[PDB]
Design a binder for these strands. Structure first.
Ligand SMILES: *[C@H]1O[C@H](CO)[C@H](O)[C@H](O)[C@H]1NC(C)=O
Ligand SMILES: [Mg+2]
Ligand SMILES: [Mg+2]
Ligand SMILES: [Mg+2]
Ligand SMILES: [Mg+2]
Ligand SMILES: [Mg+2]
Ligand SMILES: [Mg+2]
Ligand SMILES: [Mg+2]
Ligand SMILES: [Mg+2]
Ligand SMILES: [Mg+2]
Ligand SMILES: [Mg+2]
Ligand SMILES: [Mg+2]
Ligand SMILES: [Mg+2]
Ligand SMILES: [Mg+2]
Ligand SMILES: [Mg+2]
Ligand SMILES: [Mg+2]
Ligand SMILES: [Mg+2]
Ligand SMILES: [Mg+2]
Ligand SMILES: [Mg+2]
Ligand SMILES: [Mg+2]
Ligand SMILES: [Mg+2]
Ligand SMILES: [Mg+2]
Ligand SMILES: [Mg+2]
Ligand SMILES: [Mg+2]
Ligand SMILES: [Mg+2]
Ligand SMILES: [Mg+2]
Ligand SMILES: [Mg+2]
Ligand SMILES: [Mg+2]
Ligand SMILES: [Mg+2]
Ligand SMILES: [Mg+2]
Ligand SMILES: [Mg+2]
Ligand SMILES: [Mg+2]
Ligand SMILES: [Mg+2]
Ligand SMILES: [Mg+2]
Ligand SMILES: [Mg+2]
Ligand SMILES: [Mg+2]
Ligand SMILES: [Mg+2]
Ligand SMILES: [Mg+2]
Ligand SMILES: [Mg+2]
Ligand SMILES: [Mg+2]
Ligand SMILES: [Mg+2]
Ligand SMILES: [Mg+2]
Lengths: 117, 144, 19, 201, 64
RNA sequence: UAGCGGCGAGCGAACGGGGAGCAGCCCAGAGCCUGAAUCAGUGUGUGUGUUAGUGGAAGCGUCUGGAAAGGCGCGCGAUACAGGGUGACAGCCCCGUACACAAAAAUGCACAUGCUGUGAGCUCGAUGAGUAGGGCGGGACACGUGGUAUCCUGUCUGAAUAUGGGGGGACCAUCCUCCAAGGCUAAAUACUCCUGACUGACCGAUAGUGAACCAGUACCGUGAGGGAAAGGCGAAAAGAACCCCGGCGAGGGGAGUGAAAAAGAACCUGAAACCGUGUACGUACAAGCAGUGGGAGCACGCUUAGGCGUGUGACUGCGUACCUUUUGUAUAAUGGGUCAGCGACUUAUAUUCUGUAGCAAGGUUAACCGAAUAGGGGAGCCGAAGGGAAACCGAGUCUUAACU
């Protein structure tokens, strides 16, 4: 019983070549180079699902620090203030309010300022 | 019960190791042989008893004893055998008809192994003290 | 595929002797 | 245990030990597989690097060429080379213990009764060696795919069946386990059941 | 083909009842005068192959 | 296993048992009776193979389709539903197949029967000499000179001869058994360049033969010798009349054939590397494994006219390939120009352990017989008892004069 590898090997290589679409040069044409590239894309994707959470929190904090300093308080005081006043709205929402509802954000900054007073 | 509904018992057909068929399988690359040295090589491995050059155990221990040609033609008969013979007269050649001792055996000996429960007449065999008791205890008659 | 290799041909320069 | 005859409308006593026991699927499997393996011819071969036609001349010198070192044009790495582990003719036959073979027959017959597939009659023959007659007899008795086990193999019934691919006709000595399972219905003559009983004990 | 016994091992080891091996002690062949009688006496009786060595011995004696 | 063995590596019987097959004879000599057994050769009939061959059953309608053997419907043959072919898959269209027949001629085989030689049977003998054996050197015996029987003989020797001689593993005695120094002999056994038939959990064009093809060819080598590559139009050539561009070209466009010509002979399918044309988006102030996470803008397609999908990806965080080998590799250590195909833990027999199945103090057969995957065959093998170097003893035994 002899097994020709043709059909199965063809399909394995196509599987990998399809995942390499959009890559530059040999990286989207050449199995040996596409495979390495598809693995490394995988490794980055895994690593970056974590980094995405770090990068967004960092962004949110920057925006809350802007909006708070506009209202005459640092991010560090403000967040400390929000904890003493027992407010639990998370940085993703604070940042979203800082952009979209500047009245509401001032309210939150006053509640912060009150707790520290 | 059709030809496409018979299955083997669970655990009867373990699938063989296939070496050097990729990472997933856990036997890829080196195929369980590890890295380099004699044991990793095709046709590699030292011979039986080899200890790296140290005088091997089967050569630093003295030879002893000799083989008896007599032992080879000496059989032991269990009490459980005495019943299996045809005639109740356990001769040397009735034991051979019974397939109890081998054709080349010249000296048999009945030993206290199993329970004899019939009147049996042991002729021209050696018999152990324990055996003699047990055969006599069942009405048996031991004669030289 | 690859062609069968050539037998030794004349060399333009000696290999430098590190010794 | 009683097998009712459909032709004469009566009963026939058989051993519970041969037609009564539970179905040991594992044991039947081992015996069905062993039977298939016993049918294999095992006739093939490839050529090793030893057997392929060519010289033992080293294709090029060991060092200096800039190519992968080579030793034989017959290397299994090379196009036209030997097969690394070339097949030889094999015997695929397995040993089946006598008792395990008989065990499996008893399990299969006992199943052929429980699934109403063992149709026992008293007398099953045809008049002349004519396929038209047996085909007619089988449509009346109301079965297409059938194994017919008779006492002594009647020349006429042998010849009649020969050209009906769904129908096989054997003597009791000639029951194999695969045929007992392969066929939809098994028609045994009372005479044959006696022999199959005597044969299996 | 049948495994072949290492015939030298077959002369040094006998299989016992529970499946161990007995063997004769070394050091009782010659140079005896200088050895304590106590030492020699303890070398006379046969001895059992140690756990470490069993594997080697078993390999040598497949038909023991 | 017993043995052999730098007692190393390894080498490895026999006796005895089960089977297949079975077959005994002649000369060393003379007479009697005779030429009578049996082998061959040689013709002559007889059967029966072989080398050509003969017959050999049974189907129509309709649907799809280029074509029906396919679907549906209703029939028929089968001692023939092996197999092959036929415009797709045919028991009934063709060739066959089952089965039944056939030989002028030559020839194999078997008996039968003439002919030629061949010589049976009985009696009284005879009973293989430079031999057996020896010494020296080698070799063969499972057996390496060993305590080494036995066989063979290069060398040197050298009996007895049936009241005798050979062997029984140094050797001697006893006993047993056989009769060397002359020869013939069927079957069971080995093999396949080759012929026929049949079969395959064998290959299907980088496989299988080196060789599917005009291959031991082309080609290479002074020569021995080495040694490729290369299969597929279509059912049928219907293999493209004629016209047009072109060099009375190559090549192409029409036309026509065809089910199909993007089946047009550079011909089934027609992958990938690789090379182009076209469209969308991006890209000429911008630094690095080229991705990834974030993400504007643009283009497109949708079913809220709306988000959603698709393409692109300015800008921005993070980010030094893979394999191998290593204490450790972005390493400036190894290996890979790329793609496609092939390319490495097998097989046999032993042995042990695990799982599983059967049977269980038992289990199981080998060769072989059997048309038998059955059934027979228990020769054997493993187990149910060990201890001891062994004799031997034995649920004990060894140790020791004896064991607390
Ligand atoms: C070339 O190198 C070879 C060795 O490969 C010899 O040394 C030869 O002599 C060289 N020739 C020159 C010109 O140096
Ligand atoms: Mg194939
Ligand atoms: Mg592409
Ligand atoms: Mg691992
Ligand atoms: Mg390595
Ligand atoms: Mg190392
Ligand atoms: Mg190692
Ligand atoms: Mg090798
Ligand atoms: Mg040393
Ligand atoms: Mg026996
Ligand atoms: Mg290549
Ligand atoms: Mg080949
Ligand atoms: Mg059998
Ligand atoms: Mg000593
Ligand atoms: Mg016909
Ligand atoms: Mg039709
Ligand atoms: Mg077609
Ligand atoms: Mg003589
Ligand atoms: Mg002699
Ligand atoms: Mg001589
Ligand atoms: Mg001599
Ligand atoms: Mg002698
Ligand atoms: Mg006698
Ligand atoms: Mg080829
Ligand atoms: Mg092809
Ligand atoms: Mg030439
Ligand atoms: Mg033209
Ligand atoms: Mg076609
Ligand atoms: Mg094509
Ligand atoms: Mg392409
Ligand atoms: Mg600038
Ligand atoms: Mg710019
Ligand atoms: Mg640059
Ligand atoms: Mg970076
Ligand atoms: Mg280093
Ligand atoms: Mg690093
Ligand atoms: Mg470096
Ligand atoms: Mg590198
Ligand atoms: Mg570099
Ligand atoms: Mg290196
Ligand atoms: Mg390189
Ligand atoms: Mg014992």
């Amino acid at each position: 019983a002899r097994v020709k590898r043709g059909v199965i090997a063809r399909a394995r290589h196509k599987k990998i070549l399809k995942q390499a679409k959009g890559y530059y040069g040999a990286r989207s044409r050449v199995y040996r180079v596409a495979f390495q590239a598809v693995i490394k894309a995988g490794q980055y994707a895994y690593r970056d699902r974590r980094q995405r959470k770090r990068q967004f929190r960092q962004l949110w904090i920057a925006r809350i620090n802007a909006a708070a300093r506009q209202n005459g308080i640092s991010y560090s005081k403000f967040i400390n203030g929000l904890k003493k006043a027992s407010v639990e709205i998370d940085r993703k929402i604070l940042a979203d309010i800082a952009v979209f509802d500047k009245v509401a954000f001032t309210a939150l900054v006053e509640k912060a300022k009150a707790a520290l007073a | 019960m059709r030809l496409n509904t018979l299955s083997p018992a669970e655990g009867s057909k373990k699938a063989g190791k296939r070496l050097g068929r990729g990472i997933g399988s856990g036997l890829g690359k080196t195929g369980g042989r590890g890295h380099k040295g004699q044991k990793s090589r095709s046709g590699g491995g030292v011979r039986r008893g080899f200890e790296g050059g140290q005088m091997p155990l089967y050569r630093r221990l003295p030879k002893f004893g000799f083989t008896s040609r007599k032992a080879a033609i000496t059989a032991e008969i269990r009490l459980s055998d005495l019943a299996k013979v045809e005639g109740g007269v356990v001769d040397l050649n009735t034991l051979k008809a019974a397939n109890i001792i081998g054709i080349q055996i010249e000296f048999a000996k009945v030993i206290l192994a199993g329970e004899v429960t019939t009147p049996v007449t042991v002729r021209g065999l050696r018999v152990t003290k324990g055996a003699r008791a047990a055969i006599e205890a069942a009405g048996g008659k031991i004669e030289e | 595929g690859k062609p069968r290799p050539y037998s030794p041909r004349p060399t333009s320069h000696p290999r430098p002797i590190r010794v | 245990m009683e097998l009712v005859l459909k032709d004469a409308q009566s009963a026939l006593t058989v051993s519970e030990t041969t037609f009564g026991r539970d179905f040991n699927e594992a044991l039947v499997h081992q015996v069905v597989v062993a039977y298939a393996a016993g049918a294999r011819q095992g006739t093939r071969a490839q050529k090793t690097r030893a057997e392929v036609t060519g010289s033992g001349k080293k294709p090029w010198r060991q060092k200096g060429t800039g190519r992968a070192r080579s030793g034989s044009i017959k290397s299994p790495i090379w196009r036209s080379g030997g097969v690394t582990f070339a097949a030889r003719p094999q015997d695929h036959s397995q040993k089946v213990n006598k008792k395990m073979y008989r065990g499996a027959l008893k399990s299969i017959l006992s199943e052929l009764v429980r699934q109403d597939r063992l149709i026992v009659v008293e007398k099953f023959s045809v008049e002349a060696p004519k396929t038209k007659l047996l085909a007619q007899k089988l449509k009346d008795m109301a079965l297409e795919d059938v194994l017919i086990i008779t006492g002594e193999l009647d020349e006429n019934l042998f010849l009649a069946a020969r050209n009906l691919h769904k129908v096989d006709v054997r003597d009791a000595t000639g029951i194999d386990p695969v045929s007992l399972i392969a066929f939809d219905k098994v028609v045994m003559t009372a005479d044959a059941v006696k022999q199959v009983e005597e044969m299996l004990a | 083909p049948k495994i072949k016994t290492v015939r030298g091992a077959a002369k040094r080891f006998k299989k016992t009842g529970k499946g161990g091996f007995k063997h004769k002690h070394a050091n009782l062949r010659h140079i005896l005068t200088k050895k304590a009688t106590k030492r020699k006496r303890h070398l006379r009786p046969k001895a059992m192959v140690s756990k470490g060595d069993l594997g080697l011995v078993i390999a040598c004696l497949p038909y023991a």
